[PDB]
Structure 1
Amino acid sequence: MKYILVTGGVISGVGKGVIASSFGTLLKSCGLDVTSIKIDPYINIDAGTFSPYEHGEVYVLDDGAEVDLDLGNYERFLDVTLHRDNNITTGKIYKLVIEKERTGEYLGKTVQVVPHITDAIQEWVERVAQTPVQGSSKPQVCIVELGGTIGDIEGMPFVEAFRQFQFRVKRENFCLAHVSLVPLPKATGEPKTKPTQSSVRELRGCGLSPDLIVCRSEKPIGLEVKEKISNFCHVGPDQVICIHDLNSIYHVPLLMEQNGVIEYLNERLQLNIDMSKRTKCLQQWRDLARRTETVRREVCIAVVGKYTKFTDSYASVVKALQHAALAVNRKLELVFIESCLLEEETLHSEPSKYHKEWQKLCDSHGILVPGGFGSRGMEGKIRACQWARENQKPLLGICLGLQAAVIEFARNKLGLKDANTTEIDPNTANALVIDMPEHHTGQLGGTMRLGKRITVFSDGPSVIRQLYGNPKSVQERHRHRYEVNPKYVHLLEEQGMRFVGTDVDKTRMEIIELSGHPYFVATQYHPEYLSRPLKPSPPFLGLILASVDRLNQYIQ
């Protein structure tokens, strides 16, 4: 088994995830089987209790585990089905070791960090690396990404464990790629190599040595900077790879190939990769990059989301929208709209921003209402849903968007002006959205309806059923804790809406649709987690087609 370790330089947003995903893509292009392990030095057992601002959107796996978006990147670039054990956190290791000690496995000796925690980390890595991830495939290469930067107090156990690991499995099976930042201050005007030198010195003090130095900058650096880095890092001139800011992340594998990363890894790790056959290996990615470069027609989708201030809080959403837009030869113009600024309270505070956001929402061909938590920005989601339903603008709501759509429908069409969710208004006369009884045991974190489920399509002609391929039932991943009230659904269905998606029990409904309006579809689950570059999610594809006025043509 061969291992690649990707460590961090001076910042944690440097791009380790993209580098590791590109390593996996290159190694799978050759023909190998690649595993991916994400190491999160934080103590949370899972990521189900994170704000989207802290590290980005929270991914939901197939078994219900909530993990980082790095696992989403791994699944998107590698088309593999990861498990709960592909994410390693400090809390997991410490809980495991504490339980083992309490049971009596370590009887006689004291449990320490270096002999016991590091041993548990190494055993976890070795056991997970061999776990099949694409079916019956036996993996050949494991890519481990260390979250954070070198020098943190949280990463010390992991760097010590890998310092022992490189000798446990010999140097021919272990490689280490270091990703660093090369700032180019405007006032100074020249690229600076000092932070990279400090990072390399810290990594050498920790007992490791970078086989590769990936220098990340905004613009290509000169040969003087690269030579300086090679001299002051004790690394070969051809062992330093310069990756600058590219148009899309699809160019990163191509950039690393043109920098000869595959050849260096094949000689360094003894992968026995033959050069003759591996020609035109990245044809799918080259075609995708060319299509991203050569899309002229414009499609505009407005995202009424409450996590707009950070652009990576809707990573999977943006990626699914991009996949759908590329699948129809359209250039996705994404306008992020804070749902808070669409509320009437903003009008009494910042009229200019309110009008600017409303006119941004009014000039878009489509609207998307993703999920979220809390009560802030939910009224703006209601207002956007109301406007879209009134003016026949196509809209796609996800999780919280479905609840907002139901609230708007009940408040306007049914006249129940007091309709609200128990999440926001527990004392509601007409609790349109209520709580699922078995997911409020007072223990936040891994206690909702999580993972794959089964959604039953109702008996009746619905275009959303067509969009998926006219099936009887479909499977998707859920991240919801509240559900709509059955009794009002009986009323809402009669008036103007069609609940066309439910579960086997026909008690938990998931998909709503309306007669009249061309495309007004809301989902309780997240269709975005199953989107791949060549497999755009059918809901997003339908939203794009309706936005560009091509849905009817695609139907026939």
Structure 2
Amino acid sequence: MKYILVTGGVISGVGKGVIASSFGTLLKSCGLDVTSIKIDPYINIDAGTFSPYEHGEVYVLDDGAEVDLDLGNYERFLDVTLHRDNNITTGKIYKLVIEKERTGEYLGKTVQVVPHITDAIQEWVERVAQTPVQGSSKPQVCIVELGGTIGDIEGMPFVEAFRQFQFRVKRENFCLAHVSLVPLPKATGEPKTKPTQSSVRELRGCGLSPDLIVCRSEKPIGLEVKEKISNFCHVGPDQVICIHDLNSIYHVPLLMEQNGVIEYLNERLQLNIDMSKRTKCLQQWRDLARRTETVRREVCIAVVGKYTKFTDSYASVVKALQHAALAVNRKLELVFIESCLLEEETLHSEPSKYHKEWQKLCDSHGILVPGGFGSRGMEGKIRACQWARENQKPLLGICLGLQAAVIEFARNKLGLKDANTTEIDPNTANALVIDMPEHHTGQLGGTMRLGKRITVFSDGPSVIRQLYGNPKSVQERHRHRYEVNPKYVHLLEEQGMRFVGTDVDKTRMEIIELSGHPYFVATQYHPEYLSRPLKPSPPFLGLILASVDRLNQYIQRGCRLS
């Protein structure tokens, strides 16, 4: 009955995840439940023949196949999940449009775009309307998000389809909101916005009328430009949104309580409201926002990524791990260490940017594991993990590192030099980890080792099992394609390399652990994406607790501002 469109950004990787998540948690705090349906105006699936990481962070956060790139913050913030019917893209629609015109359902008539293409989208909205997730019956408000890009060639049938749902019902069910970025000059200083007056012309040229106010800034600007957008849109002057988002999420609820937008949408669509303190419950967000800005540590933590700019390997990783680190009242400092310029391409050229890198990882405490993009780095990732183990520095369990962990262990404890990289040129004789697809049920042939798999542990007392209340079968997902051979693990059992985690067939060693080390965590799944604010992650939380064991801090405050 209720359909509110959500406009993201113009490029996948700018910051549209925090904007769309603000409107989703509004109705969740008032006692209602909604969904999350998006659309990618591209070509096909991003997780197909494209690189695993370059522009979009593709993972497997609670899904049996492939995901999008901006669906990790919805499950962590809201109480909903994502399935296989949520990654709607242009490639998935074309799989059935060509099939329906070839089988024979409309007498084989030659169509164009109307009323067929605009009506085909109606089947994708009315089907996910009464089918939410495992946590609600039927959501009354069904919002539709718009990610990726906006305004292109395929943008014509999108406008003709939005007016169909509006002309059939009343005017109190839709609120159009486009997008208008606010540029910053370098010579003057007056916030003269340009995309604002240009976005109105595009809406009037297709049959739309803007009603809401869209803006994006970083600091509270003056009131001399708030009346400029009101006359250009013929809206209310006291309804201008002045969002000053920087790089977090607590810069949004503090604004709705000052302008006056929490009560405007209630009487606009005639919906219920559970009033208590201020429309929606705010005490849940104030306890996590004020307490966050009261901790500090400035500890040297050297991490390894891929490049030097803002990549897509930690866009949603550094945000989820920060909320779960508030139980220890410690702050971690993230640096930028590129693994490409570290091998022979730096020592043989200029040793200027080579000596300064080792002076920040030896005196650190937590060293992470990067990944691997074809043949763009394989020697520097080996020397980065063996040096931390010899200098009694603990490590964490990061995926895409099991291929290099078995190389440094066979050369230091034994002396197997033939065992090298097997994911580039499989030609060595001591290839421990090779490429073997799934030969069981479900997936047949050369597929990928992922999906809804049951992970069963083997031992008991450890560091990644006692935090779950002593379980027995935890549901975890993976994202890899290489498996360990059960015939080449003969030298791993006669040493101190136990296995505190196996599979349901007792063949694949997905979890490995080295005895004697004070804190050694290594597995295959990704516990960083499951970093809930109410449930800390196994690896990164256990390292800080087992460092200083400072638990007498909560009894020192005693609520000063009570």
Superposition TM-score, scaled by structure 1 size: 0.91
Task: Provide the C-alpha distance between the structure 2 equivalents of 1:392 and 1:339, rounded to a whole number of angstroms.
Answer: 22
Partner Cα distance (1:182, 1:351) in 2: 43
Distance 2:445 2:289 in 1: 38
Distance 1:317-1:444 versus aligned 2 partners, 3 A rule: farther
Deviation digits for residues 35-78 of structure 1, max 9, x if unmatched?
11121111223535544665431132433232223211211221
Task: Give the drift of 1:427.
Answer: 0.7
Q: CA deviation at 1:400?
A: 0.9
Residue number in structure 1 paired with 2:525:
525
1:257/1:451 Cα in 2 relative to 1: closer, same or farther (>3 Å)? farther
**1:353 aligns to 2:344 (yes or no):** no
2: CA distance between counterparts of 1:120 and 1:307?
A: 42
Give 1:221's aligned residue: 221
Structure 2 CA distance for partners of 1:549 and 1:252, relative to 1, 3 Å: same
The corresponding residue for 2:312 is 312
Once the two structures are aligned, what percentage of the paired residues are identical? 100
Other structure's SS at 1:386 match: helix
Q: Give distance in 2, aligned partners of 1:70 and 1:484.
A: 31
80-89 or 257-266: bigger deviation: 257-266
The yes-or-no answer on 1:379 pairing with 2:379 is yes
Distance 1:367 1:203 in 2: 50
Q: Could you tell me how far apart the structure 1 residues matched to 2:292 and 2:409 are?
A: 38
Distance in structure 2 (CA, Å) of the matches to 1:444 and 1:296: 51
C-alpha change, 1:309 and 1:393, in structure 2 (3 Å) is: same
Distance 1:384 1:532 in 2: 29
Partner of 1:343: 343
Going from structure 1 to structure 2, the CA distance change for 1:320 and 1:19 (only over 3 Å counts) comes to: closer
Per-residue deviation, 1:397: 3.4
The offset of 1:462, in angstroms, is: 2.6
TM-aligned CA distance change 1:463 to 1:31, over 3 Å: same
Aligned equivalents of 2:149 and 2:443: distance in 1?
A: 31
Deviation, 1:13, is 5.1
CA contact (8 A) 1:320 1:531 kept: yes
In structure 2, the CA distance between the partners of 1:371 and 1:554, relative to structure 1 (3 Å rule), is farther
Cα deviation, residue 243, structure 1: 1.3
- Deviation track 1:122-179 (CA, whole Å, cap 9, x = no partner) reads 2202211321214243212223221244421233333332233333454322223333
- Match of 2:247? 247
Partner of 2:559: none
**More displaced 10-residue stretch of structure 1: 23-32 or 428-437:** 428-437
Specify whether residues 511 and 37 from structure 1 end up closer, same or farther in structure 2 by C-alpha distance, changes over 3 A only: same
Contact 1:37 1:143 in 2 (8 A): yes
**Could you tell me how far apart the structure 1 residues matched to 2:549 and 2:195 are?**
51
Question: 2:377 and 2:355 mapped to 1: Cα distance?
Answer: 16
Range with bigger deviation, 204-213 or 478-487: 204-213
Are the equivalent residues in 1 in contact too, given 2:449–2:482 (CA < 8 A)?
A: no
Of the structure 1 ranges 395-404 and 298-307, higher mean CA displacement relative to structure 2 is found in 298-307
1:186-225 equivalences in 2 (<5 Å): 186-225=186-225
- Say if 1:533 and 1:111 are closer, same or farther in 2 by CA, change over 3 A: farther
Give the structure with higher Rg (CA). 2
Q: How many angstroms apart in 1 are the aligned matches of 2:392 and 2:219?
A: 44
Whole-angstrom distance in 2 between the partners of 1:82 and 1:527 = 17
Do the aligned partners of 1:454 and 1:504 also contact (CA within 8 Å) in 2? yes
| Higher RCO, 1 vs 2 (CA within 8 Å, ≥6 residues apart) | 1
Quote how far apart the aligned CAs of 1:336 are. 2.9
1:430 deviates by: 0.9
Deviation at 1:22, TM superposition (A): 0.7
Verify the 8 A CA contact 1:176 1:211 in the aligned structure 2: yes
Q: Note the residue ranges of structure 2 that are not aligned, 5 or more in a row.
A: 557-562
Measure, in 2, the Cα distance between the counterparts of 1:323 and 1:216.
24
Contact 1:450 1:477 (8 Å CA) reproduced: yes
Point out the more displaced range, 267-276 or 432-441. 432-441
Q: Structure 1 residue 88: deviation in Å?
A: 1.6
Instruction: Give the Cα–Cα distance (whole angstroms) in 1 for the partners of residues 76 and 93 of structure 2.
Output: 27
Distance apart, 1:486 and its partner CA: 2.2
The answer (yes or no) to whether the contact 1:365–1:548 under 8 Å persists in 2 is no
**Stretch moving more, 100-109 or 427-436:** 100-109
- Please state whether the residue corresponding to 1:434 is helix, strand or coil: strand
TM-score normalised by structure 2 residue count = 0.90
Higher strand share goes to which structure?
A: 1
Residue 333 of structure 1 aligns to a residue whose secondary structure is: strand
Deviations 1:499-530 (A, max 9, x none): 22210101111111111222221121111232
CA contact (8 A) 2:183 2:192 kept: yes
Decide whether aligned partners of structure 1 residues 533 and 176 sit closer, same or farther in structure 2, where only a CA change above 3 A counts: farther
Instruction: Work out whether residues 63 and 82 of structure 2, in 8 Å CA contact, stay in contact via their aligned partners in 1.
Output: no
How many equivalent pairs are there?
A: 556
Aligned-residue offset at 1:443? 12
Distance in 1 (CA, whole Å) between partners of 2:225 and 2:188 is 14
Between 1:59-68 and 1:439-448, the stretch displaced more is 439-448
Q: Please say if residues 304 and 384 of structure 1, whose CA atoms lie closer than 8 Å, have aligned partners that are also in contact.
A: no
Kept after mapping to 1: 8 A contact 2:301/2:332: yes
When structure 1 is superposed on structure 2, of 308-317 and 48-57 the one drifting more is 48-57
Spell out, residue by residue over 1:279-314, the C-alpha distance to the aligned partner (whole angstroms, 9 max, x if none): 561322221111221112344433222255324431
Whole-angstrom distance in 2 between the partners of 1:192 and 1:488: 66
Residues 9, 196 of structure 1: 8 Å contact kept: no
Quickly say closer, same or farther: Cα 1:93–1:324, change in 2 above 3 A: same
Distance in 2, matches of 1:555 and 1:433, equals: 50
| Per-residue CA distance 1:94-136 (angstroms, 9 max, x = gap) | 2122222223233343333332222222220221132121424
Does structure 2 retain, via aligned residues, the 8 Å contact 1:10–1:195?
no
Contact 1:114–1:160 (CA<8 Å) still a contact in 2? no
SS at match of 1:44: coil
